[PDB]
Design a protein around this nucleic acid. Structure first.
Ligand SMILES: Nc1ncnc2c1ncn2[C@@H]1O[C@H](CSCC[C@H](N)C(=O)O)[C@@H](O)[C@H]1O
Ligand SMILES: [Cl-]
Ligand SMILES: [Cl-]
Ligand code: NA
Ligand code: NA
Ligand SMILES: [Zn+2]
Ligand SMILES: [Zn+2]
Lengths: 299, 129
RNA sequence: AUU
């Protein structure tokens, strides 16, 4: 509608998540169309700015020395526009690590080059952002089934390296999606599919998991939920808009100083789940942040 | 010993770029311009965009010739003063951020660019109530 | 998906 044009984007209404739609083609009335970006601003700076503007309205846990990891941070340009926006948005001092299959120049504290499947860490993270997208998905299309490349890695990374209370923003499209990732959204206190207004002509969305509970609060069928997502995109045209990019006065993420505790799994009662759900608690150890990128050795 | 003696006479990025622009070569593109209020302090290099009405804020790494060329920084520690920070560039020079960060210096006193904000060398103002 |  009209009032949506001034929002950073549109979140999938909850009623769509309760339907049992059959999958079919995503057909957008404005497919391909471009929005008018501010002078000299790259599409990904505008896209990440709107993603962050929407994340500001959620109950994200924001501790001191917050840990953020950004997958799919590189570009054919050789720079990291999204990382530059995340570093602008996040409190100063926040540890930011980014990664991509191809080499690039970044503002992150550390950058890992190689397939995400080669990335290891003995630490838990507070926020996981992924803009990963396989070129194979586009050039050569096929029956729209659940994709298992970098998505299997992200599902595993969320189940083992995300702190309880932590959140994720994972990029999906009509063809770049995974049934297990949708199932994992049921392991958060809340979730949605968010469409940036500057890219509303694309089937792209960010699956946002807010406050990880480490267990399913809802059983979600991933194939049905992606059909529900496509039904929403097909029946609710979103107008292309860059309007939210012109007011950056309340952009920075507020440093809430959210408590971090190293509680066991047997000390996670309903009282703790309630605090995790309001973004008032992070559960993980606070050891030295150690990351690495596997190197394939051969002659 | 003899390897560092050769490098201090051969590979010189700063010169090669200034001469490349002197020839007429297209300045490095894809510098990451940030969205900001343009009501900032206007300092040269900052932990967050601080552009004023007369400047553009860019991600530091994208405006560093050394970072963009994937070569070592010209200092022992190999530390970068732009990477992880934001550089404010005068709008009139925003077409070549890399060239601007090389040809100018930051005032260690006020933190503004020399000749583009730094007013530490102006005559003393009469005191104001 | 890197307008
Ligand atoms: N398996 C994988 N591991 C790591 N990176 C991957 C990957 N599959 C795809 N990617 C990366 O996903 C990226 C999608 S384009 C990303 C644009 C970037 N977020 C920006 O700020 O502009 C590509 O750079 C590609 O290299
Ligand atoms: Cl439309
Ligand atoms: Cl697959
Ligand atoms: Na910041
Ligand atoms: Na687009
Ligand atoms: Zn540098
Ligand atoms: Zn000065």
């Amino acid at each position: 509608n009209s009032s949506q044009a001034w929002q950073p984007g549109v979140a999938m209404p909850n009623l769509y998540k309760m339907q049992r739609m059959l999958l079919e083609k995503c057909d957008l009335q404005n497919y391909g169309d471009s929005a008018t970006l501010p002078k000299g601003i790259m599409m990904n700076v505008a896209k990440y700015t709107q993603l962050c503007q929407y994340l500001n309205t959620l109950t994200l846990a924001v501790p001191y020395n917050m840990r953020v990891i950004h997958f799919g941070a590189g570009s054919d340009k050789g720079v990291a526009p999204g990382t530059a926006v995340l570093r602008q948005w996040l409190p100063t001092g926040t540890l930011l690590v980014d990664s991509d299959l191809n080499d690039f120049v970044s503002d992150a504290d550390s950058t890992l080059i190689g397939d995400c499947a080669t990335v290891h860490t003995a630490n838990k993270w507070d926020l996981i952002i992924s803009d990963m997208y396989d070129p194979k998905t586009k050039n050569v299309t096929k029956e729209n089934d659940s994709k298992e490349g970098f998505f299997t890695y992200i599902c595993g990374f969320i189940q083992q390296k995300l702190a309880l209370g932590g959140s994720v923003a994972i990029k999906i499209t009509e063809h770049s999606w995974n049934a297990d990732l949708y199932k994992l959204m049921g392991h958060f206190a809340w979730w949605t599919a968010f469409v940036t207004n500057v890219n509303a002509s694309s089937s792209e969305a960010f699956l946002i998991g807010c406050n990880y509970l480490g267990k399913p609060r809802e059983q979600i069928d991933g194939y049905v939920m992606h059909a529900n997502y496509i039904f929403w995109r097909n029946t609710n045209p979103i107008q292309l808009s860059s309007y939210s990019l012109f007011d950056m006065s309340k952009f920075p993420l507020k440093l809430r100083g959210t408590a971090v505790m190293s509680l066991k799994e047997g000390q996670i009662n309903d009282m703790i789940l309630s605090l995790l759900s309001k973004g008032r608690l992070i559960i993980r150890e606070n050891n030295r942040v150690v990351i690495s990128s596997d190197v394939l050795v051969n002659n | 010993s003899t390897v560092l003696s050769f490098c201090a006479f051969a590979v010189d990025a700063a010169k090669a770029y200034k001469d490349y622009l002197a020839s007429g070569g297209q300045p490095i593109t894809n510098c990451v311009k940030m969205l900001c209020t343009h009501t900032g302090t206007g300092q040269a290099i900052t932990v967050t965009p601080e552009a004023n009405m007369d400047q553009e804020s860019f991600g530091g790494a994208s405006c560093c010739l050394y970072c963009r060329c994937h070569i070592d920084h010209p200092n022992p520690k190999g530390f970068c003063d732009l990477k992880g920070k934001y550089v404010q560039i005068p709008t009139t020079c925003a077409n070549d951020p890399v060239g601007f960060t090389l040809k100018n210096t930051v005032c260690t006193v006020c933190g503004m660019w020399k000749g583009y904000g730094c007013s530490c060398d102006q005559l003393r103002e009469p005191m104001l109530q």
